[PDB]
Amino acid sequence: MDKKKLLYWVGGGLVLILIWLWFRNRPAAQVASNWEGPPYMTYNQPQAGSVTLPVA
Amino acid sequence: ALINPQFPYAGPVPIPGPAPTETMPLLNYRVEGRIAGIQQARQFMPFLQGPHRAVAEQTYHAIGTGIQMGQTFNQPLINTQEG
């Protein structure tokens, strides 16, 4: 394989570390409310302009 | 001063002077002075020590209350252009 004995073994740790971080980030968001509209009285709710749609 | 010879200014007021009195004496004053009336701790004033307001600021209290209620009318559906 011709692997030096230096930086790259550090690099393998770095790669593993980076991937673990990415996965946590991806899964690390709380299953929760982040989509917003946290005003519990919002049955009407039209923030822009007139004429809107919900499916194509 | 000018002295003029031969009329010279007497060389003194001499011994012919009339001693008029022996009233020269100031009798020393001897006295005991007492200013001792009861003192009461207080004085009345209209106002002492106040730094009166020349203008006040405006001041207020606060309240809110209610609920979240609503009657709504929505825009009609429209043909979607592109995408």
UniProtKB/Swiss-Prot annotation, chain A:
In the UniProt record, does the keyword Iron occur?
no
Q: Does the keyword Mitochondrion apply?
A: no
- The domain of life is Viruses
- Coiled coil located at which positions? none
Cellular localisation:
Virion membrane
Q: Any one cellular component term from GO for this entry?
A: virion membrane
Keyword annotations for this protein, in alphabetical order, are:
Capsid inner membrane protein, Membrane, Transmembrane, Transmembrane helix, Virion
The primary location reported for this protein is virion
Tell me where the transmembrane regions lie: 7-24
Q: What does this protein do?
A: Protein of the infection vertex complex, which increases the vertex stability. Anchors the vertex structure to the viral membrane. Essential for viral infectivity.
Q: What is this protein called?
A: Protein P16
Q: Which species is this record about?
A: Enterobacteria phage PRD1 (Bacteriophage PRD1)
Q: Lineage in the entry? A: Viruses, Varidnaviria, Bamfordvirae, Preplasmiviricota, Tectiliviricetes
Give me the gene this protein comes from.
Answer: XVI
Q: Which part of the full protein does this chain span, and how long is the full protein?
A: 1 to 56 of 117
Swiss-Prot record, chain B:
Q: Which Pfam families match?
A: Tecti-min-caps
The answer, when asked if Protease is one of the entry's keywords, is no
Q: Which UniProt keywords apply?
A: Capsid protein, Virion
Which compartments does it reside in? Virion
Q: What Gene Ontology terms describe where this protein resides (cellular component)?
A: viral capsid
Does the record carry Phosphoprotein as a key word?
A: no
Where on the tree of life does the source sit, at the highest rank?
Answer: Viruses
Tell me, which GO biological process terms does this entry list? Answer: viral capsid assembly
Q: Show the InterPro entries listed in the entry.
A: Tecti-min-caps (IPR015379)
> What role is this protein assigned?
Minor capsid protein essential for stable capsid assembly of complete particles.
Q: How does it assemble?
A: Dimer.
The protein here is known as Minor capsid protein P30
Q: Which organism is it from?
A: Enterobacteria phage PRD1
